[PDB]
Amino acid sequence: RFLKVKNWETDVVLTDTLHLKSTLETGCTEHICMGSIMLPTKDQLFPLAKEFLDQYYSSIKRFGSKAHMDRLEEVNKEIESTSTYQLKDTELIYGAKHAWRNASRCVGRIQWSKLQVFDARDCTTAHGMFNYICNHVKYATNKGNLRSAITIFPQRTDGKHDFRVWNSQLIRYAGYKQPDGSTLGDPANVQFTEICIQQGWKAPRGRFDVLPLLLQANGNDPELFQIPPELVLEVPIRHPKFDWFKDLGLKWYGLPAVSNMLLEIGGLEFSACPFSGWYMGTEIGVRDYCDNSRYNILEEVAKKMDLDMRKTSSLWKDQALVEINIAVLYSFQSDKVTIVDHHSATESFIKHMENEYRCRGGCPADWVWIVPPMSGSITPVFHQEMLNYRLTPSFEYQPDPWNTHVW
Amino acid sequence: RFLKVKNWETDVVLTDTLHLKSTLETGCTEHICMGSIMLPVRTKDQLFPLAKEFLDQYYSSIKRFGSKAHMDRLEEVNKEIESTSTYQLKDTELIYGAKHAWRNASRCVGRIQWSKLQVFDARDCTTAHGMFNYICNHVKYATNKGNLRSAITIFPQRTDGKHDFRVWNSQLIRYAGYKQPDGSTLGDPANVQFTEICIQQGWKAPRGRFDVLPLLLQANGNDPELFQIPPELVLEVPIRHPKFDWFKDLGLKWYGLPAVSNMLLEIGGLEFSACPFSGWYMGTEIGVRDYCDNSRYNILEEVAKKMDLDMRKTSSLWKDQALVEINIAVLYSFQSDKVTIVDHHSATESFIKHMENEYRCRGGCPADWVWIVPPMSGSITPVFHQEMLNYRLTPSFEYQPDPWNTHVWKG
Ligand code: HEM
Ligand code: HEM
Ligand SMILES: C=NCc1cncc(OCc2ccc3ccc(N)nc3c2)c1
Ligand SMILES: C=NCc1cncc(OCc2ccc3ccc(N)nc3c2)c1
Ligand SMILES: C[C@H](O)[C@H](O)[C@H]1CNc2nc(N)[nH]c(=O)c2N1
Ligand SMILES: C[C@H](O)[C@H](O)[C@H]1CNc2nc(N)[nH]c(=O)c2N1
Ligand SMILES: [Zn+2]
C-alpha cells in the first residue's frame, strides 16, 4: 500500500503514496498486465465536483475554509438545479495544468505549471473556434520560441451539443492513396484527408500539405478552415554532414498541437481542448519519419548513405535512424525553433519525478511511453521503475467524431 | 473471457484464451500497474493440486489425458506425496517441464527455440565436485565450438529448503569486478560483490579487466566450493569493428555462451534451485547493456572520443552514434569467429512469428513488452508496435534471493 520504486543505474529509491489517491482503472488485474495495450448525472457529478474542489482548496492552503465550504455548497446547489456546473477561471486553470501534471505518458511534465490556458468557453461557432485556434497557434509558436498552451472550448452538456476539433493535431500533413497502390504524404491521415475531401476540401495532392481545420461547434456539422500559412511554422530538414540530405525534400512543422483528446475536470467533460508544447526530436525523426506505416523513409536514407542493406546485422537501419534524428535536431536548432533531444528530456523527467515524489508523494508514469523509441537503455528513464495509475483531472481518449457524429 | 491484442503497424488482431489458465499474480491491480517493476519449504497441503495440474497438462500434450497411464501416475504421485511429502518427476516430465518453463518465460524474446532444448538431468548429483563436472559438460556441449546449442542442467529439487543445491554465480561464465580504493571499478561492475565473495573464499584474482570468474557451487545445503572452469572450455570473442581499425585497441572481448545460473525452476510444485541454462546472445545484451550501461563497462565515452564525435552537446547524438558502432562491432566479431549470435531485428522478427504461432496453436503467448523490446532502436523493431498480454503460467523460471543473503554457514 506504500510502494517503492528503484532506479537500477543509481540505486535511488522513491516511495509512492500518491497512488492511493488514484481513482480510475488501469485495465490490469492481478492475473494480467495490460501495460502495453494502447487503450485499455447528478449523483455521479457531485462527488467528482467535490473531490476536485477538495484538492483545489487544499492546494491553495484553504482546505476546510468558509470559502471552501461556500464553494462546495454553491456548486452543490448549482448541480442540484442545472444538472451541471461551471468552473471558476482559477479552477479551470488548476484543472488544466493538473491534467498535464497527471498525464502518465508525458515525458515533458517538468514544464507542467507553466501552461498558458485560453478560456474559450464563450465560443459558439466553428468560425469562432477557428479564431480561437489561430490565436492559440500564433501565441504558442511565438516565432519559434515555443510556449505551451491549451484552449478550452465549452464543456459537454447532453452529448448532442459537443464541441469537437476533428483533426488529431492542429497541424498535420495530408495523406492520399495512389492508384499506384502506395500512399502519398502521411498515411496516418489518409482517412481524415478523405473526410476533408468528402466535406469539400480542395487538396493540392502533395507530400506535405498542411491539413485544413475541421471544426465542430455545439454538435453542429463540422466546418473546414485553412490556417493562415504565415501562422504555420515549418522546418526544412537538412543534415550537418550530408548535403544530399536536403534533396530528400523533407520538412516538418514546429508545433505539436494535440487536438483529439478529452479534458476531464471535476467531472466536467471538455471534448474540444487542443493543447500544444514543443517536439522531442524522436517524435519526428524516429516515429513520424521511420515508422513503417508513416513516412517510412529508412530505405531511401540508407541507400543514400550507401550502407550494406543486405543483412540486418549490418545495423544499417540503426545507423540511418541515428543520422535522420541528428538532422531533425540540427534543422530545428539552426532555425531557432524549440526542440528537445531524447537525452535532455528524459534526464529532465527524472529530475521531475524526484520533485513529484519529494513534493507530491509520487508521479504516475507509463514506462512503455516514457522510454524514447530509440536508444532506450542509454537514457536514464530506462533504468527507472515507474508506477502507472490514473489521477484526475486527466486527458482521456475519445472516439473519432465521424464514427459518432449524428450527421 | 477472450482478450484481443493489436499490432499497430500491421493491424493484426489476436485473441488470447490462454490467460484463462493463469494462476500466479502479476503485481498489478485495477488501480496500479507495476509493469516496469523489476522484481514485483512447501507443505503436502499445497503440493498435490500443483502436481495434478502439471500432470494434467503433461498428459494432454502427449494426448493421453484421462488414460490409465494418466490416472495411475496421478495415483502414484498422490501416494508418494502423502508418504514422502514430495515426489520425483519422470525423465519425460522433467524434459517437458523444462521446455514449458522456457516457453512460459514472458520476458524472453528467444522463445521460438523453446522446443529444441537439451535437458541434462543432474538429479543424481550429491557434491559440488559432481556439480562442477555436470556444468563443465554443459558448457562444452552447449558451446559446441561456437555453434551454440540451448541446454539446461537440472540439479536436485529442494526438500526442506535446508539442503539446497545452488550455483552462486549469476552466470556460468562472467567477468570479475574489482572496486579500487579510488572509487573506480576494474572489470565488470555488475560482479564486484560476487568477485569479493570468491576472493574471500580463496580465489586468487588476476585483477584484470576480463578475468573469468570461478564457479562457486553449493550442494545439498553445504558451504559452497570454488572451481575453475578449464580455460579451454571458455569460448571468448575479441571485439573489433569492420571499418574501424582502432576498435580492436579498445581491448574488448566477450564470452560466447550466455548461461544464466541464479534462477529457480518450478515444475508441478517442485522447486529446482539450481538449473543453469544457456542459449545464445542477442547482440544488444553485450553491445548495449554490458558495454554501454553507465553501471557496466561504460565504454560510450571512450568510443565516442576515438570516433571524434561532437561530444559537447548531447543533441549531437554522439551517444546514439557510438552505441550503434559498438553493436556493429559485437555482431561482426561474433560472425567473423563463427560464434552463434542474433541481431535484435532478426530476433524480434522471429518473436512476432513465434507469438502469432502461439496464439494460433496455444491460445496465447504471455509476453513482457518492457523486456521484449530491444534496449536500442526500439520502434524500428516490430515488437514495439505489438500489444502484449503479460501473465504467469507454470512451469516457470522464478527469481530467488542471492544465496549469500540466505545461506547458513557451516564453516
Ligand atoms: C512542452 C514540451 C512537451 C514535450 C517534450 C512532451 C513530450 C511528450 C512525448 C514524447 C509524448 C509521447 C507521445 C507520442 O509518442 O505520441 C507525450 C505524450 C503526452 N503528452 Fe506531453 N509533451 C510536452 C507538452 C505537453 C502539454 C503542454 C500537454 C498538455 C497540456 C501534454 C500532454 C500529453 C499527454 C496527455 C500525452 C499522452 C497522450 C496519449 O495518451 O496518447 N504534453 N508528450
Ligand atoms: C537460444 C537463444 C536465446 C535468446 C536469443 C534469448 C534472448 C533473451 C534475451 C535478450 C533476454 C533478456 C535478457 C536481459 O535483458 O537480461 C532473455 C530473457 C530470458 N530468457 Fe531467453 N534467450 C534464449 C534462450 C533461452 C533459454 C534456453 C532459456 C531457458 C531455458 C531462456 C529463458 C529466459 C528467461 C527465464 C528470461 C527472463 C530473465 C529474467 O526474468 O530476469 N532463454 N532471453
Ligand atoms: C497517435 N498515437 C497515439 C496518440 C493518440 N492520441 C494522442 C496522442 O498524442 C501524443 C502527444 C500528446 C501531446 C504531446 C505534447 C507535446 C509533444 N511534443 N508531443 C505530444 C504527443 C497520441
Ligand atoms: C541482471 N540482470 C537481470 C537478470 C537477472 N536474472 C536473470 C537474468 O537473465 C537474463 C537472461 C536469461 C536468459 C538468457 C538466455 C539467452 C540469452 N541470450 N540471454 C539471456 C538473458 C537477468
Ligand atoms: C503496442 C505498444 O503499446 C505501442 O506501440 C506503443 C508503445 N509505446 C509508445 N510510446 C510512445 N511514446 N508513443 C507511442 O505511440 C507508443 N506506442
Ligand atoms: C525499471 C525497468 O523495469 C528495468 O530497467 C528493466 C527495463 N527493461 C529491461 N529489459 C531487458 N531485456 N532487460 C533488463 O534488464 C531490463 N531492465
Ligand atoms: Zn500492469
Swiss-Prot record, chain A:
Found, by tissue, as follows: Isoform N-NOS-1 is expressed in brain and colorectum. Found in the Auerbach's plexus of the enteric nervous system. Isoform PNNOS is expressed in the penis, urethra, prostate, and skeletal muscle, and coexists with the cerebellar nnos in the pelvic plexus, bladder and liver, and is detectable in the cerebellum.
Q: Outline the subunit composition.
A: Homodimer. Interacts with DLG4 (via N-terminal tandem pair of PDZ domains); the interaction possibly being prevented by the association between NOS1 and CAPON. Forms a ternary complex with CAPON and RASD1. Forms a ternary complex with CAPON and SYN1. Interacts with ZDHHC23. Interacts with NOSIP; which may impair its synaptic location. Interacts with HTR4. Interacts with SLC6A4. Interacts with VAC14.
Give the species: Rattus norvegicus (Rat)
Residue ranges annotated as transmembrane are none
Where does this one sit in the cell? Cell membrane, Sarcolemma; Cell projection, Dendritic spine
> Function, please?
Produces nitric oxide (NO) which is a messenger molecule with diverse functions throughout the body. In the brain and peripheral nervous system, NO displays many properties of a neurotransmitter. Inhibitory transmitter for non-adrenergic and non-cholinergic nerves in the colorectum. Probably has nitrosylase activity and mediates cysteine S-nitrosylation of cytoplasmic target proteins such SRR. Inhibitory transmitter for non-adrenergic and non-cholinergic nerves in the colorectum.
User: Which residues bind (6R)-L-erythro-5,6,7,8-tetrahydrobiopterin per the record?
Assistant: S36, V368, W369, F382
UniProt lineage: Eukaryota, Metazoa, Chordata, Craniata, Vertebrata
Superkingdom, taxonomy of origin: Eukaryota
Its domain comment says: The PDZ domain participates in protein-protein interaction, and is responsible for targeting nNos to synaptic membranes. Mediates interaction with VAC14.
Identify the residues that bind L-arginine.
Answer: Q169, W278, Y279, E283
Q: Can you name this protein? A: Nitric oxide synthase 1
**What family does this belong to?**
Belongs to the NOS family.
Q: How is it modified after translation?
A: Ubiquitinated; mediated by STUB1/CHIP in the presence of Hsp70 and Hsp40 (in vitro).
